[PDB]
Amino acid sequence: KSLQYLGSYIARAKKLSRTQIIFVASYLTSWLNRYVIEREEEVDQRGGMERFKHFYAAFQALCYIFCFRHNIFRDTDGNWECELDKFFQRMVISKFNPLKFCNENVMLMFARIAQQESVAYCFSIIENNNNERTRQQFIDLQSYFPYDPLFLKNYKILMKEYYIEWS
Amino acid sequence: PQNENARAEALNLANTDSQYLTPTSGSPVRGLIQDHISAGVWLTSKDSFFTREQYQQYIYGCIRPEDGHTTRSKIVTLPPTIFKPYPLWTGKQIITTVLLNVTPPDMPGINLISKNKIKNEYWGKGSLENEVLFKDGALLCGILDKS
Amino acid sequence: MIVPVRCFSCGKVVGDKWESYLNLLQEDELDEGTALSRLGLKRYCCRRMILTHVDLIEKFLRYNPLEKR
Amino acid sequence: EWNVEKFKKDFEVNISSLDAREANFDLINIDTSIANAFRRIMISEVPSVAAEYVYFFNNTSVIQDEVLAHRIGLVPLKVDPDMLTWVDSNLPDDEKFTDENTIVLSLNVKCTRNPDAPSTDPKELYNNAHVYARDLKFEPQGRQSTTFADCPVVPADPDILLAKLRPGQEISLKAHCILGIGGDHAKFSPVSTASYRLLPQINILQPIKGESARRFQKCFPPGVIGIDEGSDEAYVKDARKDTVSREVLRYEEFADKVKLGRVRNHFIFNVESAGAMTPEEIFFKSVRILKNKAEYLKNCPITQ
Amino acid sequence: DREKIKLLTQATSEDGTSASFQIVEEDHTLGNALRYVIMKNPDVEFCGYSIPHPSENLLNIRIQTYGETTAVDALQKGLKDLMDLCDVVESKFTEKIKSM
Amino acid sequence: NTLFDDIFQVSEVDPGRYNKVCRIEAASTTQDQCKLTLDINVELFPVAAQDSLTVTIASSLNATRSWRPPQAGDRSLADDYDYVMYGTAYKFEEVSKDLIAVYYSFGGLLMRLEGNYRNLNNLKQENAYLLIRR
Ligand SMILES: [Zn+2]
C-alpha cells in the first residue's frame, strides 16, 4: 500500500517536479534492475509465486503512471525515456509472468496504448494466460487504489484545482 | 484450548502420531482391526486378481494428490504383472504402490520378515503364504492379516 | 395405525390395496397369501405392509371429545 | 483404438414387455459403469413434481398434524413435468410462488353423524367418514386455466386412506406443489424402482439326458430347462426366465456337470412407477439431462 | 457460473501434464461414467475418481497422459464422447421404441 | 536377450482351494533334476497333467522408461508368446553340489528352480519376462 501511495500521487496531479519523479524514484527503477540481477535464482525452491507482493504492485504503480501521462513519457529528441525498448521488455518471459497475476481495470488498459504507441506486445499471451491460470482474501489489498477519482460535488471546489481529466 | 500456546503442544504432543506405541508393555493399540482387515484377506491373496481399471481406481481413492501425497512430481505405478491382451494385476501389487507413492525419494524401501495367523494348511497343501517378505517394500509373498 | 403411503423402500403406494384387502378377508372368502398376491405385488418388501399393518386408529377413534360419550 | 461406430454396431437394443406400468428392457452391449448413469438418473436426478408446503388451517382429528402433513405432500401427483419450471428458493413467497411454480391444491372434509340402524360399518354410519385422495382437488391461481383443460391434475390413485374421522371433527387444509429431484426426498422419485438384473449365463458341460433330465428340471424353474427326448441333448431353452438362485449347487452331483455365470454385456431392466410417470416416458428424462449434464461441463471457463 | 471447473494447481506440473480437476455437487454419475471413456482415449496413462467427503456432494478427478496432450484437453474428448454415449441410446433406440 | 531356455513337463496339478490359481510341478525334458515350481494362473493358460511347456526367462525386449500400453505394430520379442510374467528374484539357496536352487516370485506367486546351467547367466534379478509357448 505504501508504494501504492505513489500511484495516483504522481498521475492525477499537476504540480510535480517531473525531472525529479524519475530522479527520486530512480531507486525503484534501480529496484527493477536489482530484482533481475540478484533475485532470480530462487523460484524453483520451496515456495510459490506470492512471496513478492512488492513486485506485482510497485511495478504496477509505475505502470499506473503509464496510461495517464503519455506526453510526459516522450522527450524532444525522439528516443524513449530511459530506453523503454529494453527496460519494460526484459520482464516478459521470466520466472514470474508479470502479465499473469494482474488487476482488471488498469491492468487491462494495457491493450490500447501498448500497440498504437509501440510500447509492448502481449496480444498472443492473453489467450495463454487463462489456461495455466491468506491468499483468497489477498486480492482485497491489491484491488483498491488510494487516490481514486473524486465523486462529491462541493469538495470538488477545492480539488478540481490540481486534478485533470482522462487525457 | 482457549489460548494459542496450547495449540503448540496439543498439535505436537497429544497428537496421534506420538501415541502409536503405548507405554504399558510395548504392545501397540492403534490400527484398523474390524472390517478393513478381514477384507485384507480377500484383497491381496491370489483369488483377487485385478484389471488396469481396478488397479487405477484403487489407488486414486487412496492417495488424493491434490491434498499433497506425491513427492517427485506426480503419481506413478509399476509395470503390470501379466503381459497379455489384458494386463492383469495382483492384490500383492495393490499394497505395494500405495506403500510407494508417499515416501519421499533418497530413501530405500523397507524389508520385513514376519508371520500371520493363517497357517498355510488352510490354503491347501505346500503353498507357503503364512510368511511375509518386503523386498523393497512389497508384499512379495504371503497374505497380510491381523498380525 | 394408518397405512403408510408409498411403502418404506419399494416406492409403490400400497394403500388402495388395504381396504381392498379388507374386502377380501371379510366376505370374499379368500386366503391370506394369494388374496394379498392378487393385487399387483411384484416384490416382497411390499408384502408385509398389508400382512403386518395393525390398523390402530380404532383405539384413537374411540376417544372423541368433540361428541358426547 | 476407440471408435464410436465400433460401438454403434456393438450397442444392441431389444424391448421385452413394455406397458405404461412396466417395461422389460433388453438394453444390451453396455458396461456396468453405465448401468448406474442410466439407473440413478432414473431414480433421483430426474424431475418429479410433488406437494411440499402444507398451509394448514385446522386439524381437528385424533390424527396428529405432523404425520398427516407429510402425506398430503407425499401422494403421487398425476401431473406432467415440463409444464412447470424451476422454483426460486430463498426469496419471500410473493415472487416465489407464482402460477408458474405452484399447483394450488386444497382439501376440506367436515364429517358428521348420520342416523342409521345397526360391527356397524363406519362408511355405513357417517357422512364424509373416510377422506381419500379423491377429496383433494385442484384450483388454479394466476395466469393458467387452459393448460389443465385437457387434464385436471388429479391425484394419481384416489384410494389412499388419508384419515378416518368421527363426528364432530373436521379437516380443511391447503397444500402447495413444487418440482423436486429424488436426491432431496423420496417423494420426488418418479419411479418406484429402477433396479437391474444381468442375463444369467448358465453352463453345461455334459449331456444330462436320461434320468438327470427329470432331475435337472425339478429344482430349476420349469420353463428354463428344455428336455428334448431321451436323446438330442437337452438344451436349456430360456435364459432370462430364471433367477440366479443356484439351488443346483446344493446338490452333490450337479456340482461339476453344470456351471453358471453371467453375461456382463446383456441387461434387462424393470422400471415401474406409482402412476404419475410411465416407463415409456422417462428414458428421455434420464438421458436428455445427462446429455445436458455433459455439454454444460465442457464450455465452462477454467479458473485460477 | 465459475463454480464448476476449478484447476486445483496444488497438484500440477508446469506445462500441465496432469491435474486434479475440481468439480462440485456431482456423484458417481460422472466418475463411474467418464472414467469409462477416458481410458478409450489412447493417450491416457492414468485416471480415476475420488470423494473429498462421502456425506456432502463433491468430486475430484485427475487424468494422466503422454506428450502432445495436456490435462484439460483430455477432458475435452472424454466429455465429447459422453455427448455421444447417450446419443446412441437415442439415435438407434428411437427405432426400437417405434416398432415394439 | 534370453537367459534361460528349455522344455518342461507338468507332473501334477492341485487347486489349493483357490479360484484362478493352481500349483504346478514341472520337471524337464533335457536334464533330470530341474524341477520348476509353478503357481499358474489357470484362466489365461489352461494347464493339465503332462503338457508340453517351454519355460524361457529372458530379461528385456529389444530409453526404455516403463510400461507404455501396447500400441499398434510394435516390436516385442515376447510378441510370439502369450502368458508373459514379470517379477523379481529374492532368495537363493543351495542343494547338492553343482546345483544352485533359487526362490522366485511374481506378486505372491512362488517358483523354485533347481538346476545347474543358470549359474553363468542368471542371478538375483529384477526384470524378467517369462516367454511361454503353447
Ligand atoms: Zn415391495
What is the spatial distance between Cα D28 and Cα D16, in angstroms, rounded to a whole number?
12
What is the spatial distance between Cα D265 and Cα D251, in angstroms, rounded to a whole number?
29
Tally of CA atoms within 13 A in the half-sphere of E88 that contains its CB: 20
Q: Which amino acid is at C48?
A: R
**CB-nearest partner of D169 from C5, C18, C66:** C66
What is the spatial distance between Cα A96 and Cα A40, in angstroms, rounded to a whole number?
9
Number of Cβ pairs closer than 8 Å across C and D? 73
Minimal CA separation from F64 to chain B, in Å: 12
Q: At C51, is the secondary structure helix, strand, or coil?
A: helix
CATH number of the structural domain spanning residue B25: 1.10.274.100
Q: At D203, is the secondary structure helix, strand, or coil?
A: strand
Q: Which cell is C11 given? A: 416406492
What is the spatial distance between Cα D62 and Cα D75, in angstroms, rounded to a whole number?
21
What is the spatial distance between Cα D280 and Cα D18, in angstroms, rounded to a whole number?
8
Residues 6+ apart with CB under 8 A from F111: F36, F37, F38, F39, F102, F103, F104, F105
What is the spatial distance between Cα B75 and Cα B58, in angstroms, rounded to a whole number?
13
Whole-number CA gyration radius for chain B: 19
The residue assigned the cell 525503484 is A28
Residues 6+ apart with CB under 8 A from B81: B87, B88, B89, B90, B93, F85, F86, F87, F106, F107
Residue-wise over D45-64: b if at least 16 C-beta within 10 A, else e?
bbbbbbbbebeeeebebbbe
| Chain E residues within 8 A of B77 when measuring between CB atoms | 46
Among candidates A110, A86, A116, A80, which has minimal Cα distance to A98? A110
Q: Do chains A and B touch (3 or more CB pairs under 8 A)?
A: no
C-beta separation of A95 from A36 below 8 A: no
The residue assigned the cell 503364504 is B129
Residues 6+ apart with CB under 8 A from E91: none
| Cross-chain Cβ contact E29/D13 below 8 Å | no
| Chain A residues within 8 A of E72 when measuring between CB atoms | 131
Query: DSSP string of D65-118?
Result: TTTTTTTTTTSPB---TTSS-----SS-TTTTS-TTT---EEEEE--EE-----
Question: What is the DSSP-derived secondary structure letter of residue D210?
Answer: S
Distances (CA, A) of D239 to A30, D202, D257, D260, D268: 85, 8, 18, 11, 12
Query: DSSP string of A90-103?
Result: TTSSSSS-TTTS--
* Helix/strand/coil (H/E/C) assignment for every residue in chain F: CECCCCCEEEEEEECCCCCCEEEEEEEECCCCCCCEEEEEECCCCCCCCCCECCCCEECCCCCCCCCCCCCCCCCCCCCCCCCECEEEEEEECCCCCCCCCEEEECCCCCEEECCCCCCCCCCCCCCEEECCCC
CA triple A104-A108-A111, angle to 5 deg? 170
Residues 6+ apart with CB under 8 A from D165: C61, D61, D109, D111, D126, D128, D129, D130, D131, D171
Residue of E nearest to A130 (CA): E7
Domain boundary among D147, D171, D186: D186
Query: What's the domain count of chain E?
Result: 1
Classify residue C54 as exposed, middle or buried by CB count within 10 Å of its CB (0-12, 13-18, 19+): exposed
What is the spatial distance between Cα D171 and Cα D228, in angstroms, rounded to a whole number?
67
Specified resolution (Å): 4.0
* Helix/strand/coil (H/E/C) assignment for every residue in chain B: CCCCHHHHHHCCCCCHHHHCCCCCCCCCCCCCCCCCCCCCHHHHCCCCEECHHHHHHHHHCCCCCCCCCCCCCCCCCCCCCCECCCCCEEHHHHHHHHCCCCCCCCCCCCCCEECCCCCHHHCCCCCCCCCEEECCCCEEECCCCCC
Tally of CA atoms within 13 A in the half-sphere of D180 that contains its CB: 22
Question: Can you list the pairs that D154-158 forms with residues at least 24 positions away whose Cβ atoms lie under 8 Å?
Answer: D154/D78, D155/D75, D155/D76, D155/D77, D155/D78, D156/C13, D156/D75, D156/D76, D156/D77, D156/D78, D156/D274, D156/D275, D156/D276, D157/C13, D157/C15, D157/C16, D157/D76, D157/D133, D157/D274, D157/D275, D158/D132, D158/D133, D158/D134
Question: What is the DSSP-derived secondary structure letter of residue A150?
Answer: P
What is the spatial distance between Cα F19 and Cα D31, in angstroms, rounded to a whole number?
24
Minimal CA separation from E66 to chain F, in Å: 9
Q: How many residues does chain E have?
A: 100
Q: How many residues does chain B have?
A: 147
What is the spatial distance between Cα D44 and Cα D286, in angstroms, rounded to a whole number?
10
φ/ψ of D59, rounded to 5, equals: -140, 85
CA triple D25-D75-D53, angle to 5 deg? 125
Residue-wise over D261-277: b if at least 16 C-beta within 10 A, else e?
eeeeebbbbbbbbbbbb
Q: At D6, is the secondary structure helix, strand, or coil?
A: helix
Domains of chain C: 1-69 (1.10.10.60)
| Chain A residues within 8 A of E16 when measuring between CB atoms | 131-132
Q: Is C45 annotated as a binding residue?
A: yes
CA of D130 to the centre of ligand 1 (A): 26
| Residue A130 near chain D (CB below 8 Å) | yes
**CB-nearest partner of F20 from B47, B128, B140:** B47
The residue assigned the cell 432331475 is D215
Distances (CA, A) of D71 to C13, D74, D187, D276: 11, 4, 10, 16
| Chain D residues within 8 A of A133 when measuring between CB atoms | 304
CA of C45 to the centre of ligand 1 (A): 3
CATH number of the structural domain spanning residue D179: 2.170.120.12
Domain that holds residue E3: 1-100
What is the spatial distance between Cα C11 and Cα C46, in angstroms, rounded to a whole number?
9
Residues 6+ apart with CB under 8 A from D52: D73, D176, D177, D178, D180
Q: Which amino acid is at E75?
A: L
CA of D34 to the centre of ligand 1 (A): 26
Query: What's the domain count of chain D?
Result: 2
Q: Which cell is F111 given? A: 517358483
CA triple C55-C60-C61, angle to 5 deg? 90
Q: Name residues 39-68 of chain E within 8 A of F (Cβ).
A: 42, 45
Q: At C3, is the secondary structure helix, strand, or coil?
A: coil
Domain that holds residue F31: 1-134
Q: Are residues D12 and D85 in the same domain?
A: no
| Residue D40 near chain C (CB below 8 Å) | no
Minimal CA separation from C42 to chain D, in Å: 11
Residue of B nearest to E21 (CA): B66
CATH number of the structural domain spanning residue F85: 2.40.50.140
What is the spatial distance between Cα F104 and Cα E59, in angstroms, rounded to a whole number?
42
* Helix/strand/coil (H/E/C) assignment for every residue in E11-42: HCCCCCCCEEEEEECCCHHHHHHHHHHHCCCC
| Cross-chain Cβ contact F108/B140 below 8 Å | yes
F contact set with E (CB within 8 A):
69, 71
Domain that holds residue D208: 1-47+187-304
| Cross-chain Cβ contact B140/F107 below 8 Å | yes
C-beta separation of A67 from A109 below 8 A: yes
φ/ψ of D197, rounded to 5, equals: -165, 130
What is the spatial distance between Cα B75 and Cα E18, in angstroms, rounded to a whole number?
9
- Strand duo D48-59 + D171-180: pairing: antiparallel
Q: Are residues D161 and D280 in the same domain?
A: no
Q: Which amino acid is at D109?
A: V
Distances (CA, A) of F62 to E68, F1, F58, F120: 25, 8, 11, 22
| Cross-chain Cβ contact B73/E47 below 8 Å | no
* Helix/strand/coil (H/E/C) assignment for every residue in D33-59: CHHHHCCCCCCCCCCEEEEEEEEEEEE
What is the spatial distance between Cα A103 and Cα A64, in angstroms, rounded to a whole number?
11
| Chain C residues within 8 A of D193 when measuring between CB atoms | 10-12, 43
Q: Are residues D169 and D242 in the same domain?
A: no
What is the spatial distance between Cα D294 and Cα E30, in angstroms, rounded to a whole number?
9
Q: Which cell is D98 given? A: 407464482
What is the spatial distance between Cα A137 and Cα A139, in angstroms, rounded to a whole number?
5
CATH number of the structural domain spanning residue D194: 3.30.1360.10
Q: In what order do the strands lie in the sheet with B113-114?
A: B113-114, B132-134, B139-141
Tally of CA atoms within 13 A in the half-sphere of F65 that contains its CB: 5
The stretches of chain D forming alpha helices (DSSP H) are 5-8, 34-37, 283-286, 291-298
CA of D195 to the centre of ligand 1 (A): 12
| Chain B residues within 8 A of E10 when measuring between CB atoms | 66, 68
Q: Which cell is D59 given? A: 386439524
| Cross-chain Cβ contact E45/F71 below 8 Å | no
C-beta separation of C55 from C1 below 8 A: yes
What is the spatial distance between Cα F34 and Cα F111, in angstroms, rounded to a whole number?
12
Q: At A138, is the secondary structure helix, strand, or coil?
A: coil
Among candidates A6, A3, A11, A4, which has minimal Cα distance to A149? A11
CA of E25 to the centre of ligand 1 (A): 31
The residue assigned the cell 502369450 is F82
Q: Are residues D94 and D25 in the same domain?
A: no
Query: What's the domain count of chain F?
Result: 1
The residue assigned the cell 498504437 is A116
| Chain E residues within 8 A of F71 when measuring between CB atoms | 42
Residues 6+ apart with CB under 8 A from A158: none
Chains with 3+ CB–CB pairs under 8 A to C are D
| Chain D residues within 8 A of E89 when measuring between CB atoms | 11, 13, 27, 38, 283, 287
CA of E27 to the centre of ligand 1 (A): 27
| Residue E35 near chain B (CB below 8 Å) | yes
Question: What is the DSSP-derived secondary structure letter of residue D130?
Answer: E
Residue-wise over A115-149: b if at least 16 C-beta within 10 A, else e?
eeeebbeeeeeeeeeeeeeeeeeeeeebeebebee
C-beta separation of D208 from D257 below 8 A: yes
What is the spatial distance between Cα B47 and Cα B59, in angstroms, rounded to a whole number?
19
Whole-number CA gyration radius for chain D: 27
What is the spatial distance between Cα B120 and Cα B128, in angstroms, rounded to a whole number?
6
First to last CA, chain C: 23
Tally of CA atoms within 13 A in the half-sphere of D227 that contains its CB: 16
C-beta separation of E71 from E16 below 8 A: yes
**Method by which the model was determined:** cryo-EM
Q: Which cell is D71 given? A: 402425506
| Residue E70 near chain B (CB below 8 Å) | no
Residues 6+ apart with CB under 8 A from D198: D262, D263, D264, D266, D267, D268
Mutate to test the interface with E, among A94, A132, A135 (most CBs of E within 10 A): A132
CA of C40 to the centre of ligand 1 (A): 10
Q: At C49, is the secondary structure helix, strand, or coil?
A: helix
φ/ψ of D77, rounded to 5, equals: -100, 115
CA triple E24-E25-E30, angle to 5 deg? 85
Distances (CA, A) of C13 to D47, E98, F50: 19, 31, 64
Which residues pair with residue E63 across a beta bridge?
E19, E47
CA of C14 to the centre of ligand 1 (A): 9
Cβ atoms within 10 A of the Cβ of B26, count? 7
Residues preceding chain discontinuities in chain F with C to N over 2.5 Å:
62
What is the spatial distance between Cα B36 and Cα B58, in angstroms, rounded to a whole number?
14
| Cross-chain Cβ contact B44/F108 below 8 Å | yes
Four-CA torsion A99, A103, A109, A111, nearest 10 degrees:
30
What is the spatial distance between Cα D283 and Cα D38, in angstroms, rounded to a whole number?
8
CA triple D79-D82-D86, angle to 5 deg? 105
Q: Is C3 annotated as a binding residue?
A: no
- H/E element holding E98? helix E93-98
Q: Which cell is C2 given? A: 394408518
Among candidates E72, E39, E18, which has minimal Cα distance to D1? E39
**CB-nearest partner of C64 from D67, D75, D168:** D168
What is the spatial distance between Cα B140 and Cα F111, in angstroms, rounded to a whole number?
12
Chains with 3+ CB–CB pairs under 8 A to B are E, F
| Cross-chain Cβ contact D301/A131 below 8 Å | no
What is the spatial distance between Cα A82 and Cα A63, in angstroms, rounded to a whole number?
14
Q: Which cell is F77 given? A: 520379442
What is the spatial distance between Cα F70 and Cα F86, in angstroms, rounded to a whole number?
16
CA F108, distance to chain mean position in Å, is 14
Give chain C's largest Cα–Cα span.
46
Among candidates D13, D89, D91, D94, which has minimal Cα distance to D52? D89
What is the spatial distance between Cα F118 and Cα F89, in angstroms, rounded to a whole number?
13
Q: Is C7 annotated as a binding residue?
A: yes
| Cross-chain Cβ contact E17/B70 below 8 Å | no
C-beta separation of D106 from D155 below 8 A: no
CA triple D230-D235-D240, angle to 5 deg? 140
Q: What share of chain C is helix, strand, coil (3-state, %, to 5)?
A: 30, 0, 70
Q: Is C53 annotated as a binding residue?
A: no
Classify residue D37 as exposed, middle or buried by CB count within 10 Å of its CB (0-12, 13-18, 19+): buried
The residue assigned the cell 387444509 is D173
